[PDB]
């Protein structure tokens, strides 16, 4: 209906730069600094490996059939050749996991031989880790006194080598493997070697890692289905062992030729061969179990630090499973939870059965009709299922380590990257989880992939990573990763939201990082960016990128000048979006740093001038940035600016104006910046300069993913309003109930000056002459809040208005000097934040708010009416009034956007249509005394007719300006000294106040509806400023206040 004029859908000042309770982020405050946890720089290497092998062949030790070792029958070759070959095999078996490390073998040794072995390994691999592999199968079991058994020369005795002396020979960075019976006994000895303390875990201290085959009481298996070398052959030859175990147990065994496992085609590297793909799946399966089972710190040490420890501890989870089946329970020193029977070995068992059945026919002919296992595809689907349902901080997604494994092969690279990005998007926690798995270096190497299929996803992944951790700068620049995103800025690949991310990724790459600046400078990032300057987030981030590039880097600054950067940036200072403008100010701001002119003085004068044009900006966000650029400039020109400040107390006098202007700004955070800039000049070493915040605030956009009750309370109020509009109109309004429903003591010593009834709640707002703001409830007879609108000494209240009545009202408070302050949560007991503050008019300021258009009209004792668009926070228009005397009163129409009424000091009246090339519509006298118009308003209706024109002379004059100049109707409110007027929004009713104590309500046709007399509380006889008369918007409730100290409320029974 037409009553959609009465209900404006325009919301204003409810954007992220106007943020509320927890976040003082909006601006002023610096960005939230982080402290990372995933950081262990030391990529450790196992440099030396000592294989000690204690087996007399056909001489069992007296603690006693199966006897295979390193996949050799030691009886088949005779003792000395057998023991050589097993030494050679076991070496190459280990060597496949760590090919760049030295391997030294020791067969049936003396204690003296082991001493030199260990001393030599430690001397070879100084800080690097040393591996000790012991095999005590042909010697007695380790003691409870902490002993290993070796030989003497002649092989007549078993000689006890104590663990103490081993651990003296090898030191700190070392790792042990004990493939013997009763192997725990060694680990218990190790635990007691050193003094307890030196840690905050179960029982640790050094960097001594220990893998052992079985428990204290336990003995290694004896059945022929296992070898003797079970633990070793799990740890060192996992696939061969896993399958051979699988045949002999699960499928029952006699169907499948077991020796096909030895003849599996391909090599362990090729993921496209059947062997290497089975080895891939194993790593993927094993690594996944470890990640879901262990905590961040322990997993990273064992599974991410050393290529060989990662292999050994991966392959240890197979031992955890197999040994178990043969009455053995192995233990590592960093102990790790139970790993067998995890829902994931199930997936291995499946993949191995599908492999082993296939193997029979691939041997019949090398057909290479090897179907890649579904495993990977199957698991990425279970990651998608997780990403929909339960996708919270509701325990990790489990498939995550497998998503990493897929990034390593083109086979399913795009969907993996897509799903990873989908996962990173849900928050910082998910970025923290991904980086913990170890996604960083793989995603970093993918910045050499030319495939355009990827890049759009890769920019997004990197956006999310760099939104969390800024420090990846160093790694990105070192690999030339910066070029990947510069390409993306200059690409033909569409979508400018992707390009903003590119510009953000580069801005972070550059941020306080001269290696990155210089790299991007050579890569022509000034040219790339400035090419695009001819969407708002993209513009915002081009400036932030450019600004960060030249910041404190004079080569780039020179390049920016001689690429006319000022000429391209400056036009963004007019843009409607505050975010853009503020970013534009930043960019020009960071370009900075008698009678002489060289190149730069032409630029830096032209820059600072263009910044000073935006000192008066409506957004504090902008003003903050302008003050920082002024601070920077002020640093460089202290010589000149002090001399300019001497005479004030070419361009420098303009700066001093702006500094003192900033110091008296309504937003106190801006004010304090102005006070800072002043103090840099010496009015009352770089570290004193304030720092820009526009970059830090904007970055939060990316660390944030890329509802219904919003409409609920909207329609609540609209239904209430539409109904009460019709009732206001259609009910035949009776006389005033002179018995007031409240007579509230403000405790304003001088009295109440302006007041405001709330539409959708039972609330009053009142204002002192010093701009204290109270929020009185009339239905509870209580105070909801108390304020001080600003601490400045020169006070003065002009106006109170609600902004966004239909959805969480903000309280506008206009001051007589033209300052405007808008407060959220003004009804709360003392949690009431200043949302925005700016100086309209650039006195006796008068103001009015038009929700329909988003326009704030402001003027006073000035030639002009000033127009503010609060969606933009800009000074949209300066309309000359064409009066040559002051605007005393000012009413914007609720219905018709743009259209404005204005009363004047000489009693005159003017319409404006502020959206017209010539704004003044008509100019009329009506009432003819030559006294100021104390109040006016458009009539309650849907036309441009006008109650208007209460003159201070006392006559209220009605006029319909479509048809005639002279008056509809005159009503004589008061013989002189009319001090206020109130015109209802919808109901056909008005009211007027006198300095002679008196208040008179009238009908719109002119009838008297009720006299009231505000009596004085003592005999000052000064009820002479009956200033606040105001109606409830949707009800017939009056509210009256005066030069005494009471706010009385009335109604019509």
């Amino acid at each position: 209906a037409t009553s959609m004029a009465y209900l404006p859908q325009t919301i204003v000042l409810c954007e992220l730069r106007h943020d509320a309770s927890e976040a003082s982020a909006p601006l002023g405050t610096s960005e939230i600094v982080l402290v990372p946890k995933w950081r262990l720089k030391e990529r450790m290497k196992t440099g030396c490996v000592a294989l000690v092998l204690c087996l007399n062949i056909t001489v069992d030790p007296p603690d006693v059939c199966a006897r295979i070792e390193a996949w050799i029958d030691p009886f088949s070759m005779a003792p000395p050749k057998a023991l050589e070959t097993i030494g050679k095999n076991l070496s190459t078996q280990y060597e496949r996991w760590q090919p760049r490390a030295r391997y030294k073998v020791q067969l049936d040794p003396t204690v003296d031989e082991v001493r030199k072995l260990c001393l030599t390994c430690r001397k070879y691999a100084k800080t690097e880790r040393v591996l000790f592999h012991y095999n005590g199968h042909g010697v007695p079991k380790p003691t409870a006194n902490g002993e290993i058994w070796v030989f003497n020369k002649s092989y007549t005795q078993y000689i006890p080598l104590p663990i103490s002396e081993l651990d003296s020979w090898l030191k700190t960075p070392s790792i042990y493997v004990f493939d013997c019976s009763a192997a725990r006994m060694i680990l218990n000895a190790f635990a007691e070697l050193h003094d307890w303390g030196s840690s905050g875990s179960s029982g640790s201290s050094r960097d001594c890692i220990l893998l052992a085959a079985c428990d204290v009481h336990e003995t290694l298996p004896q059945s022929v289905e296992f070898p003797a070398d079970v633990f070793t052959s799990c740890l060192t030859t996992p696939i061969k062992m896993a399958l051979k175990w699988f045949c002999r147990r699960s499928l029952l065994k006699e169907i499948i030729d077991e020796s096909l496992i030895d003849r599996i085609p391909g090599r362990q590297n090729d993921r496209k061969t059947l062997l290497g793909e089975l080895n891939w799946i194993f790593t993927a399966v094993t690594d996944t179990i470890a990640w879901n089972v262990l905590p961040h710190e322990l997993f990273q040490r064992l599974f991410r630090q050393d290529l060989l420890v990662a292999s050994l501890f991966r392959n240890f989870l197979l031992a955890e499973r197999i040994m178990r089946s043969a009455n053995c329970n192995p233990i590592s020193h960093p102990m790790l939870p139970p790993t067998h029977q995890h829902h994931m070995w199930d997936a291995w068992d499946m993949a191995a059965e599908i492999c082993l059945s296939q193997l029979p026919q691939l041997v019949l002919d090398p057909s290479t009709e090897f179907q890649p296992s579904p495993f990977f595809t199957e698991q990425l689907t279970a990651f998608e299922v997780w990403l929909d349902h339960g996708s919270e901080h509701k325990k990790p997604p489990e498939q995550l380590p497998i998503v990493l494994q897929v990034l390593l092969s083109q086979c399913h690279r795009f969907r993996a990257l897509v799903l990873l990005g989908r996962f990173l998007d849900m928050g910082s926690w998910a970025v923290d989880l991904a980086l913990s798995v170890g996604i960083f270096p793989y995603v970093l190497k993918l910045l050499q992939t030319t495939t355009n299929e990827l890049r759009q996803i890769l920019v997004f992944i990197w956006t999310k990573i760099l939104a969390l951790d800024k420090s990846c700068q160093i790694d990105l620049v070192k690999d030339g990763g910066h070029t990947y995103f510069i390409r993306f800025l200059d690409s033909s690949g569409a979508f400018p939201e992707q390009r903003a991310m590119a510009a953000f990724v580069l801005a972070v790459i550059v941020d306080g990082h001269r290696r990155g600046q210089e790299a991007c400078l050579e890569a022509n990032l000034i040219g790339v960016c400035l090419g695009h300057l001819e969407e708002p987030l993209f513009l915002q981030w081009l400036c932030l990128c450019l600004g960060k590039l030249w910041e404190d880097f004079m080569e780039a600054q020179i390049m920016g000048r001689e690429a006319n950067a000022f000429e391209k940036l400056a036009p963004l200072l007019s843009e409607p979006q505050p975010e853009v403008r503020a970013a534009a100010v930043f960019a020009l701001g960071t370009l900075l740093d008698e009678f002489d002119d060289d190149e730069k003085i032409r630029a830096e004068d032209a820059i600072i001038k263009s910044l000073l044009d935006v000192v008066s900006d409506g957004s504090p966000l902008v003003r903050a940035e302008v003050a920082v650029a002024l601070a920077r400039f002020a640093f460089g020109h202290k010589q000149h600016l002090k001399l300019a400040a001497a005479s004030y107390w070419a361009v420098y006098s303009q700066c001093v104006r702006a500094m003192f202007a900033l110091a008296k700004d309504p937003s106190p955070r801006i004010a304090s910046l102005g006070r800072r800039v002043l103090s840099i000049i010496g009015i009352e070493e770089r570290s004193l300069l304030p720092l820009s915040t526009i970059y830090g605030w904007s970055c939060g956009h990316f660390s944030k993913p890329l509802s219904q009750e919003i409409a609920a309370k909207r329609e609540e109020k609209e239904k209430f309003a539409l109904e009460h509009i019709a009732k206001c109109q259609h009910s035949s309004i009776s006389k005033l109930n002179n018995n007031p429903i409240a007579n509230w003591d403000t405790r304003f010593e001088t009295g109440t000056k302006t007041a405001l009834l709330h539409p959708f709640s039972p609330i009053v707002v009142a204002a002192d002459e010093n701009e204290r703001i109270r929020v009185w409830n009339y239905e509870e007879a209580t105070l909801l809040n108390g304020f001080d609108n600003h601490d400045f000494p020169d006070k003065g209240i002009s106006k109170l208005c609600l902004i966004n009545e239909l959805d969480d009202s903000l309280l506008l408070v206009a001051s007589c000097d033209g300052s405007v302050r808008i407060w959220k949560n003004y009804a709360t007991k003392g949690k009431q934040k200043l949302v925005t503050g700016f100086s309209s008019i650039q006195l006796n300021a008068v103001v009015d708010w038009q929700q329909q258009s988003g326009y704030l009209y402001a003027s006073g004792e000035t030639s002009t009416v000033t127009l503010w668009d609060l969606e933009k926070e800009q000074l949209v228009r300066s309309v000359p009034s064409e009066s040559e005397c002051g605007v005393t009163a000012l009413s914007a129409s609720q219905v018709h956007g743009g259209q404005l009424a204005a009363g004047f000091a000489d009693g005159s009246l003017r319409l404006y249509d502020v959206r017209s090339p010539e704004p003044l519509v008509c100019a009329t006298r009506p009432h003819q005394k030559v006294e100021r118009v104390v109040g006016l308003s458009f009539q309650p209706g849907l036309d441009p007719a006008k109650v208007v024109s209460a003159s201070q002379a006392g006559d209220i004059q009605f006029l319909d300006l479509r048809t005639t100049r002279d008056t509809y109707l005159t009503i004589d409110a008061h013989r002189g000294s009319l001090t206020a007027l109130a015109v209802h929004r919808h109901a056909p009713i008005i009211a007027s106040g006198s300095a002679k104590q008196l208040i008179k309500v009238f009908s719109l046709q002119g009838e008297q509806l009720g006299i009231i007399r505000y009596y004085p509380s003592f005999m000052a006889q000064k009820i002479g400023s009956v200033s606040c008369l105001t109606f409830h918007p949707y009800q017939v409730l009056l509210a009256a206040g005066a030069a005494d100290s009471f706010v009385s409320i009335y109604t019509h029974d």
Partner: peptide
């Protein structure tokens, strides 16, 4: 930097 190989 990583434990596992990558194909490109």
């Amino acid at each position: 930097a990583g434990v596992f190989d990558i194909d490109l």
